Amino acid sequence: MITVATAECFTHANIGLTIHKAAAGYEDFEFKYLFSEEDLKLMKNVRVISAMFVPSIIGVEKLLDIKLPEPDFNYKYAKAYSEEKDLEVAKLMAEGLKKKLNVNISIGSTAGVGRGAICILTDNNRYLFTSDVYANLITFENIKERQKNGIEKGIKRFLEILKKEYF
Amino acid sequence: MITVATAECFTHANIGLTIHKAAAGYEDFEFKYLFSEEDLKLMKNVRVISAMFVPSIIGVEKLLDIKLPEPDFNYKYAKAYSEEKDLEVAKLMAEGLKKKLNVNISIGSTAGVGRGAICILTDNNRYLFTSDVYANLITFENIKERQKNGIEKGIKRFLEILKKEYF
């Protein structure tokens, strides 16, 4: 099968969980509306190996054997980066997942202050994009909007990528 | 702070994600009704290191450096066990995660055919219990109700344990 793993922060493991529910044939799930019935047949050929929510630097570093840059802001509950570092970390997490679990497609996401970053790494190519929503992990400004936008954009891009590269 | 990590299957990382939203002070979240006002103050002292959804045997094994038993049933999208092995696996995952990440409190959950299993392992004690809902991961029979009860029972027990042991 086509195997997928994700290491997600702002999107709370929902990109991986959605991929899993779609693949397994769930008839109701939060982001099902993004999939056509044809997309859902293609998704039966995908298996999720793991979908991790990894807010801790020490968590990410220990589970994936990578090393992350120092946070840009002090924040007790999650590593907190500005945009430049979120883009760097999404790539480092996707790459580390791909090495640790040997999957076809790895997905990293992270967002501190700004639009956040999602990296989708396949066997062929690496895709890196921001969300549409500026938010702030610490003040909570726009954080739910950013989360929902990031999940939707992550899944839309994942489906485009899967179809382009694998179907 | 009190650190927590989770390795969840049937509960979809929602035990750990709920713990994180309560601890970070989210104003509204799906299972907030489980927390009293005093509970939410206590929760500010908790940090989530990772909450992982790990439906594959290979995923759990590689991320925690453990070995799990062979599945009882053939099923493509997730490891599939009888209740006796679910009870073994929830323990093996909670113990492996606590050694991998050195957290105060580790939680594992798994459910195939039957009521499933949740393990809460603290610095002091190991708790292990089934959910209250018989379901079947392969047919989807009652899986939604088992998931909800598993998250509710997991959180309700986690709070009782956190207060008894840490407060």
Give 3-state DSSP helix, strand, coil % of chain A, rounded to 5.
45, 20, 35
Residue A68 contacts B where some CB pair is shorter than 8 Å: no
- Under a CB-based contact definition with an 8 Å cutoff, are residues B120 and B93 in contact? no
Q: Where are the beta strands (DSSP E) in chain A?
A: 2-8, 46-53, 105-110, 113-114, 117-121, 126-129, 135-136
Task: Give residue A114's identity as a one-letter amino acid code.
Answer: G
Tell me the shortest Cα–Cα distance from B129 to chain A, in angstroms: 24
Are B59 and A50 within 8 A, CB to CB? Answer: yes
Facing residue for A50 by CB, picked from B24, B56, B140: B56
Length of chain A: 167
Instruction: Write the CA distances from A95 to A164, B71, B158, integer angstroms.
Output: 21, 29, 34
Which of A8, A50, A104, A151 best probes binding to B when mutated, by most B CB atoms within 10 angstroms? A50
Which of A4, A14, A77 best probes binding to B when mutated, by most B CB atoms within 10 angstroms? A77
Residue A59 contacts B where some CB pair is shorter than 8 Å: yes
Supply A97's token pair.
């997942």
Length of chain B: 167
Resolution in A: 1.7
Residues of A in contact with B78 (CB under 8 A): 24
Q: Locate the domains of chain A by residue range.
A: 1-167
Could you give the 3-state DSSP secondary structure of residue B45?
A: coil
Beta bridge partners of A5: A50, A106
- Under a CB-based contact definition with an 8 Å cutoff, are residues B40 and B162 in contact? no
Tell me the shortest Cα–Cα distance from A161 to chain B, in angstroms: 21
Method underlying the structure: X-ray
Among B55, B130, B122, which Cα is nearest to B94's?
B122
| Alpha helix ranges (H) inside chain B | 14-23, 37-43, 57-64, 83-101, 143-166
Residues of A in contact with B12 (CB under 8 A): 17
**A134 contacts: CB under 8 Å, gap ≥ 6:** A114, A115, A142, A146
CA distance A49 to A4: 6
Which chain B residue lies closest to A75 (C-alpha atoms)?
B24
Beta bridge partners of B8: B53
**Cα dihedral B82, B94, A89, A93 in deg (nearest 10):** -40
Residue B47 contacts A where some CB pair is shorter than 8 Å: yes
Instruction: Write the CA distances from A59 to A66, B93, B162, integer angstroms.
Output: 10, 16, 21
Residues of B in contact with A61 (CB under 8 A): none
